[PDB]
Structures are given as structure tokens and as C-alpha cells.
Amino acid sequence: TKQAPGVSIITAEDIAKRPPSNDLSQIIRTMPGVNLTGNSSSGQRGNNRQIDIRGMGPENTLILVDGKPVSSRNSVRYGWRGERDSRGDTNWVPADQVERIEVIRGPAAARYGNGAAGGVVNIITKQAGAETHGNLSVYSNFPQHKAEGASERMSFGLNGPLTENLSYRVYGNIAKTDSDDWDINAGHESNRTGKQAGTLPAGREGVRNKDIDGLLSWRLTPEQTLEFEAGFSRQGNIYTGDTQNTNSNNYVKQMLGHETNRMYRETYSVTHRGEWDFGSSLAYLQYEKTRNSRINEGLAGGTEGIFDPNNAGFYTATLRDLTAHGEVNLPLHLGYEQTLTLGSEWTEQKLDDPSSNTQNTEEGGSIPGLAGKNRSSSSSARIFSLFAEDNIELMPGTMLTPGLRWDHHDIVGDNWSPSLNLSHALTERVTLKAGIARAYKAPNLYQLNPDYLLYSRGQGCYGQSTSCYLRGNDGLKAETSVNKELGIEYSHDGLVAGLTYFRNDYKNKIESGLSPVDHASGGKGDYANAAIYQWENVPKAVVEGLEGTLTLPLADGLKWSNNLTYMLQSKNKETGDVLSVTPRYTLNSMLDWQATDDLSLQATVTWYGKQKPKKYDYHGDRVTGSANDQLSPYAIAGLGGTYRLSKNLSLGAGVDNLFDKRLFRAGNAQGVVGIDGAGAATYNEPGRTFYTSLTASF
Ligand SMILES: O=C(N[C@H]1COC(=O)[C@@H](NC(=O)c2cccc(O)c2O)COC(=O)[C@@H](NC(=O)c2cccc(O)c2O)COC1=O)c1cccc(O)c1O
Ligand SMILES: [Fe+3]
């Protein structure tokens, strides 16, 4: 099956029948338990949605490529409201060079440690064979409405032997997703008056991709395999007016249609793989270096996340992330039959950001212990990690899997993440699974850094109108979550029916504080002696919901598949406001007809439930008027097909959003002065879009 309780596989064949425009989030998000959301509820950078597992937000979704972490979005400034102006980290690997994607949700993911509190998405690449194989894949879409950006994608792959004991695989991708027109949301925007008259909430940012990977696999002995690979990728955007608060100035407009951020991502990796009689071994060294080059933004109030015209030009933030990992697997023949796994992990995150720590104290007054100018650019954290997995077969069909993970964070201190996963054959066709683990979240280098400083004259200050500073806090605790799940699944002859309940009890969620810890001294007029808030640990939050799957073989050539997410609860237990904004439910429905030996046909529908905005503004006061707007449930239908011309050539064609259901970003969720809120109307849903594809392969 592609769906067990807590786990989902997406295969290469699924990627081909529901082709993504560009980014994989498009297909990853259709798995049970998975949403495409912002990190908190501000709606800021709302067209920049990323993969969320069980409403735990996308910072708690760990992205791997071939078992190796991607950390590149940790190069983008983390803002007051817990969003980054980032497209996330699911668009580094081109769709057509993916072998399969593994999604692991909740208690079975806690064993991966830091930032798997929601789950793990592991994007697996196609590898060399015993002979030389390769492909050339091209995709091109055509929106009905010209405003919305079309997507074009060309990727090759090429793998094979060199000697009997030397293998290689290489691929290369070139792609572009045109931005939405600067004016797509015109006539849909929230009410904008005074200074903010004429402002617009932006459509989807465009991106240009360039990806190149080379891998050499070397098995210098029957038991011993040694892999070296390098990765070079480059994303440059196409700017279409997006700003944190949806305000505008002249620099913004100058940059419509230009590259305003470029991410270069370089990965080198050494991997040694061992199989002998005692069992199985694996250890890797990955060096990920991310350069985030983008136009300087302001760091104060309504100027937070708008191009700063007084400091025009590009800065470059540099993220050097170092990962080494060791694991063994030992089969044991004991009172109960079992398999033991022993592992260390070492990581280093160096962040050089020459822009983020430049907010000065001339207006709100100075902060004892914080220099007002020329503060360090530098942040780092090392985690050391030890873990052991025991995979115990009590009686055939039954597995009990206890694991202990211990992590030493060189600032925050010690974390203990224990876990237990039970799976039970009640019948040869029915299987019960229960799991309770405590997952782990290290504060990001922005939250942690006493040199990282935002400012507001009041409009963004919790429980007051006065000027206030928000400050990094190296005193922070790690976020932990006791992810519980109880689930049942019938599976027999491609008939699959399953339903899982999950509850994550969420401790110490890090977030902009609610009480001043202190007050600065000096500064200008009514702004002087501003209040000082830090990044605080929220004592308690809860997420809760249901994951379902149902697969029926209607006839031999014909398969009816369904995945269900239903989000029961998502609650900051301090304020009572929501954590994320998700659709109440999500049903993805595919009919797959194998019409001929050669012709396959696919109809899909996605139903999205209601979406409700946050109840409280930045003050902690109740929002009013269009800040309360909700999005009604809506559905998106699509047809496609793939006509195989030969062993060497396949063609695809179809239509996303058959009935042209469209939604428009009205702005952020709450009111500010001159910019009415837009409630849950914070993203653009594209209309009818034709697409065609071609895959040539030996
Ligand atoms: O969305 C927010 N702004 C909007 C809406 O707010 C406004 O337009 C006005 N605004 C206040 O009246 C305000 C009254 C009482 C208190 C205020 O803070 C006001 O700003 C004027 O500010 C501005 O025109 C600009 N603003 C600064 O230059 C600034 C410079 C330094 C420091 C600032 O705070 C600045 O606003 C841009 O502000 C905006 O576009 C917004 C969000 C989050 C937090 C904010 O503070 C926001 O203001
Ligand atoms: Fe302000």
C-alpha cells in the first residue's frame, strides 16, 4: 500500500499522473495529515505556503533528500510573526528525477530528532542500475487567465557503471514559474485608505531554477559501499509586489518583474554503506552552504519586510550547515525476536546575516547589553545526538519499537525524546497501530540571538500602544511535543480502508512575547523608553485531528483512491487563538482508468473545508470587520492522461481546476491603519490551467 497509519509513499508513477508545475509541495500536500500553510496566523507572506504535517507548522516539517537534511530556509530572516520570506525547501530536487517521496507523521518521526515534531518528508532520487539508463523530461502549462504565471520545466537524468565496482548518477534541471501579474488581486484587495490607498496584496512570486547533481557510488568490496556527491542549485525570484504588511513604496514598484532574491544551495556529501553478517551500517558527512542574496528590508513596524530605500542594494546571508550521522542495525535472536539500531548524530549551523541585526535604538531608547550599531552578524548551534531503536517481534504480525533519543544543544542544554510504536495484526487483513513519542524542536538562530532586534512604535506591541522592541533570547527552552496516534487499517487485494486519530500536546512553542521583561532608556518623544519583549516559550498548545484513506478497485483497469485530513483542534492554550490556519478538512480523490495497454486516464477532485482567521490582533485585542472574513468550502477538479508511444517515449496532457474556481489574496489577516484585514483570504488559488508533458528514456 501507499498509505499505512502515520506513513505515506508517493511513487515516481504518481508524480507522472499528477505532474507538479515546479515545486513538489503540490503533490506532497495531497497525503493524509499534510496541509500547505504559513507558520503562524498573520497571513504575512501568505502566497509563500509550505508543507505542514498535522498543523504543527512547516518549521516542524524536516525535509530530507536521500536521508540528508535540507536547512536552506534557515538562511532567511525569521520575522516577528514566525514567517520567513521563503518558498520553503521542497523545490531543490526536480520532480522528474524523484524515485519516491516518504512522509512520516507524528510519533514514528520523533526518532529523527530536531524539527520532526510534525514529521519527516524524505525526497528520494533515482539511482544508477546494473546497466546505463537515462531520461529527458519536459513539462509546460498554460493558464486560462493571463494574470496567473505559466510554468516550464526541462530535466535530464543519466546513470550507469564505469567499472564492475564503480557506479554514477547525474541529473540537471532548468525551470521557470512566471510570477502572477502585479495587478492580479486588483478589485479583490481589502479596503485601503489614506497613505495606503492604491496598495496591493501580491500574487504568487515566480522562480527560476538551475539544479545539477553528480554522484559516484564505489563498492570497493562485497560488503563495503562508498558514495561521493555534490549538488549545485540556484533559485532567483520574479518579484510581483509582495511585502510583509502589503504596504508599498517606490523601490517596491521599481523591482516589479526583477530578481530581488537569489538562493544558491551547494551540497557535498560522503556516504559509506555497510552490509555484513552481524548486520548493516551507514554513516554520512553532508556540507550544505546556502547564500541568500536579497535586497535590504527594514526591521521596524510597517517597515519590517519592505525594501529599505535608504540602504538600497543586495546583502548576502550565508548558512554553512554541517551534518555527520552514524547508524548500525543488529538482528538479535533472544526470548523475543528483534532488530537493534545504534546511532550518533553531529550538526553545526553557522549563520552569517549582515542585515537582520542592524535595527538601532535611537528612537525607542538604548538596551543595556545590546550595542545600537555594528552588532555581530554571527550565530551558530551544535547539537550532539545519541539514539537506539529496538524493533521487537513479540508474535508474528506484532512489532513493538521502543527508541531513546538524547540530544545536547550547546546553548539550550539537554533534550530527552523517548518513543514507543506498536503495530498489531488483529486479522491477516486488519492491523491496529498505536504510538506515543516526545518530539524535539531547537530554537532557530534568530529566536536565540540577543543581537536580533525588531521595533514597533506600538501597532505591533502586545497589550499596549507604546513603542516596543522584540529581542532574541539565548535563555529559551527547546519546544517539545508528546505526539500520540491511535489508528486502524483494513488491507486485502488492493482494497484499503483506514482511519487514524492523532493528538500532539505541544510544550514551550517559541513565539513573540506578551509581557515586557524590561524597558529601554532614552530615544525620541512619545516613543522614548520603549518596552522590551523577548521570544518566549508558550507553556501549552494542542493539535488534534483525523487521517483517513480508502482505496476501492471498481474493476480491473480502474482504481478509486481517497485521502482525508480532518483538523479537530489547533490551539495556543495561553491566548486561545489558532497556531496555523488550515482548512477544517481536505479530501483528495483520484479515479485511475488504465483505458488500454498504452493509455492511462486520471480524474481528481480536492475538497477544502472552511478556513477561519485568528481572533486576536498583535495587541491581543479582538479583530473586527473584514478581519473576521472566512473562506467557504470549495473543490478543485482535474482530468489528465499519459499516452505511451513506445518503451522510449510517453506524452502527458490534462487540465488542473476544470471549473475555474479562483481565490485572491486580499492582504494579511488583521486590520492595520489604512489597510483593512483580509481574514482567511491570504493566498491566490489559480484558475483553469492546461498542461502537457513528454518523457523520453532508455
Ligand atoms: O502594518 C503596519 N503598518 C502599516 C500601517 O501603519 C501606517 O501606515 C501608519 N502607522 C501608524 O499610524 C502607527 C500608529 C501607532 C503605532 C505604530 O507602530 C504605527 O505604525 C504610518 O506608518 C507608516 O506609514 C509606515 N510605518 C513606518 O514607517 C514605521 C517606522 C518605524 C516604526 C514603525 O512602527 C513604523 O510603523 C508603514 O506602516 C504601514 O504601512 C504595522 C505592522 C506591524 C507593526 C507596526 O508597528 C506597523 O506599523
Ligand atoms: Fe508601526
Residue numbers in the entry: 24 to 721
Which statements did the authors publish about this structure?
The structures of pyoverdine, pyochelin, citrate and ferrichrome iron complexes bound to their respective transporters FpvA, FptA, FecA and FhuA showed that the ferric-siderophore complexes were bound inside the barrel adjacent to the plug domain, a position thought to be poised for translocation.
The data collected from such crystals revealed additional difference electron density that could unambiguously be modelled as a single Fe3+-enterobactin molecule. The ferric-siderophore is bound to PfeA by residues from loops L2, L3, L4, L7 and L11 on the extracellular surface, and is partly exposed to solvent. The side chain of Arg480 sits between rings I and II and makes electrostatic/cation-π interactions with ring II. The oxygen atoms O6 and O3 of catecholate III hydrogen bond to Ser479 and Gln482; O5 and O2 of the catecholate II hydrogen bond to the main chain nitrogen atoms of Arg480 and Gly325, whilst O4 of catecholate I hydrogen bonds to backbone nitrogen atom of Gln482. In the Fe3+-enterobactin complex, the peptide bond at Pro28 (β-turn type II) flips resulting in the formation of an anti-parallel β-sheet rather than the α-helix and in disorder of the TonB box. We do see a correlation of movements between the binding site of the Fe3+-enterobactin molecule in the extracellular loops, the top of plug domain and the N-terminus. This suggests a route by which siderophore binding could be coupled to TonB engagement.
